[PDB]
Amino acid sequence: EVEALEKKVEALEFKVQKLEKKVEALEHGWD
Amino acid sequence: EVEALEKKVEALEFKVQKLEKKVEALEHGWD
Amino acid sequence: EVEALEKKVEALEFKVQKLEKKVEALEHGWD
Known part of the structure; x- marks a missing residue:
């Protein structure tokens, strides 16, 4: 269970x- | 603790x- | 490993x- 959690947490972090990054661009009107 | 983590991780995934989905729509100008 | 996970999960929740909140504002045209 713990390694299962570690994989998902790393996936969630990505x-x-x-x-x-995408939301910062929309908020800032970048590009 | 582990089941506590599993619940939160599943909630975070949702x-x-x-x-x-919402950000993809804003980036793509959908709808 | 478990406390490592708990820290990251709490960071992810924040x-x-x-x-x-930011996406709700962009979707709603707040402000």
Whole structure:
């Protein structure tokens, strides 16, 4: 269960960092 | 603690997938 | 490993709640 959690958490971290970048661009009107 | 983590991770996954869909729409100008 | 996971999950929760607020504003045209 723990390694299952570790994989999902690392996957969630990647996804959340991508979302933060995209949302920062929309908020800032970048590009 | 582990089942506590599993619940939160599953909740985070739902929330992150919803965010991805909404942000994809804003980026693509859907609808 | 478990406390490592707990820290990251709590960090992810903070980040996801912030993303939800920002995206709700963009979707609603707030402000």
